[PDB]
Amino acid sequence: LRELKDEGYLRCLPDGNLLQTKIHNIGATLVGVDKFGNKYYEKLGDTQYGRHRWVEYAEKSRYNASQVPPEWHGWLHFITDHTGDELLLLKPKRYGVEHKENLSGEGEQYIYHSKGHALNPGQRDWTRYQPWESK
């Protein structure tokens, strides 16, 4: 009881949204679970058109959008009703970068910079010539 109540249930009391999603869940079914741990549900039926596919982020305190991987992002925004597991069966090989949410606030190094910005360890130089540079 108290285990899951602390895991992903009692946070709703001061979080609000989680309560609405728990209600949508008691109405819901299950359609997917993604490596970031998060659960995608679909309460298809007489509900509505805008709200019958949604996601519980499985990060109860600091849940933020863009945590969804691309495949489930598609399936969630209704662009294509192909499930995340199918698009991940596709999943281009020979390259690729794992997902990473839009940090943009957790220090510049988790954040990033151009090739001329002083905080970037690169710090290129733009001259389009060379000096004479005697020994």
Partner 1 sequence: VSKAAEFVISKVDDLMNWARRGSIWPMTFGLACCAVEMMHTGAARYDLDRFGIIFRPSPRQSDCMIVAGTLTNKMAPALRKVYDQMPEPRWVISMGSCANGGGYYHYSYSVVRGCDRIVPVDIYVPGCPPTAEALLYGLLQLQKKINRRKDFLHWWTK
Partner 2 sequence: TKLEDEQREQLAKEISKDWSSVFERSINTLFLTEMVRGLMLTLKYFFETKVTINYPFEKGPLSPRFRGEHALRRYPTGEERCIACKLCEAICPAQAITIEAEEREDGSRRTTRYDIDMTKCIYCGFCQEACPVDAIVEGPNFEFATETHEELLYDKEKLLENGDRWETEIAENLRSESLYR
Partner 3 sequence: YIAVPAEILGIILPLLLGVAFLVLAERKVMAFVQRRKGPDVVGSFGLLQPLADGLKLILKEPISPSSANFSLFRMAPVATFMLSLVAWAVVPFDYGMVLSDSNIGLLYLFAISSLGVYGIITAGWSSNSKYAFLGALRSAAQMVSYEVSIGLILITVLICVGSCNLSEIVMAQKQIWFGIPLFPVLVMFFISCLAETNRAPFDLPEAEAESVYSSMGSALFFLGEYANMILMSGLCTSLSLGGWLPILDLPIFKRIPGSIWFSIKVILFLFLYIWVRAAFPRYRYDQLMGLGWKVFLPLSLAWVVAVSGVSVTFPWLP
State the residues that interact with partner 2 by CB under 8 A. 17, 20-21, 24, 48-51, 53-57, 63-66, 70-71, 73-74, 76-80, 82, 87-88, 90-100, 102, 104-105, 111-115, 117
Amino acid at site 81: D
Between residues 49 and 126, which has the closer beta carbon with respect to ligand PC1? Answer: 49
Give the pair of three-digit tokens for residue 56: 């519980």
Residues ≥6 apart with Cβ < 8 Å to 58: 8, 36, 37, 38, 39
- Report the 10 Å Cβ neighbour count for 32: 17
- Residue 50 in the binding site for partner 3 (CB under 8 A): no
Instruction: Decide if 91 contacts 74 (C-beta within 8 A).
Output: no
Smallest gap from residue 51 Cβ to partner 1 (A): 11
Stretch that binds partner 1, among 33-41, 63-71, 112-120, 124-132 (CB under 8 A): 63-71
